[PDB]
Write a protein that binds this ligand. Structure first.
Ligand SMILES: OC[C@@]1(O)OC[C@@H](O)[C@@H](O)[C@@H]1O
Ligand SMILES: OC[C@@]1(O)OC[C@@H](O)[C@@H](O)[C@@H]1O
Ligand SMILES: OC[C@@]1(O)OC[C@@H](O)[C@@H](O)[C@@H]1O
Lengths: 90, 90, 90
């Protein structure tokens, strides 16, 4: 068994976020051009995917964390992570 | 065992598509700014990845669905899903 | 058990890169508008994710290859793949 990752990036420098699912926990490593550091995202999950988009200079991130058949969406919109409206009927 | 997801997004609103592989079947949930709904994509696969690109206002999506060592590419180019030219020698 | 893929794309044609983890090995298939071909990326790993960004017309790619709890970052910046600075404490 190996960890499972998901990655997103924005800008030209760039900024990168790498999410790793490891033993049921998803953590985040961050690059903003001057070294990797540990991000504020730490949530349960066995599987992770991510997407992001810019609006001007403002980044928006969506992380999809799944355990069993339940997927939880986590949202970054400039001022902290929040749970999103995503639902699915798996 | 957990489901496995892949996500893409475009624009600023934005639009988001989340693909979930669950028990050998890949389905699609969609956001266009006003609620999540079930998309037209429903194909067999144990693993999924996705990428997309805009040409002006027109979205193009590629979904890579894998079962065993066989990966099938599915294409959205504005008027329905079609099988793509992707091949690999896995 | 199925192979596991990750995909990225850039431009409008577009260019696409699809990475496949298969039996501990990650390989790359490439589209630049006129057929799929095998890319120069061939590295060990049981899991793969990818992100990319344009700077003008220059593509930059980051591939995250994981075996066990160890993730290795591979970088394309226009002139060959190189190992990146990414670390994590998994
Ligand atoms: O500046 C770092 C940070 O705020 O960037 C946005 C998100 O990736 C956060 O989890 C992360 O801590
Ligand atoms: O408007 C929704 C839709 O047409 O958007 C493009 C694709 O994601 C389709 O599967 C989906 O049904
Ligand atoms: O032109 C093809 C190529 O150079 O494109 C950039 C990377 O995807 C490489 O592995 C690949 O061989």
């Amino acid at each position: 068994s190996s960890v499972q990752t998901a990655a997103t990036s924005w800008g030209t420098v760039p900024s990168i976020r790498v999410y790793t699912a490891n033993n049921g926990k998803i953590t985040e490593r961050c690059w903003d051009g001057k070294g990797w550091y540990t991000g504020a995202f730490n949530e349960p999950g066995d599987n992770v995917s991510v997407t992001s988009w810019l609006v001007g200079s403002a980044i928006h991130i969506r992380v999809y964390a799944s355990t069993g058949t339940t997927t939880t969406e986590w949202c970054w919109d400039g001022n902290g992570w929040t749970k999103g409206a995503y639902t699915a009927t798996n």
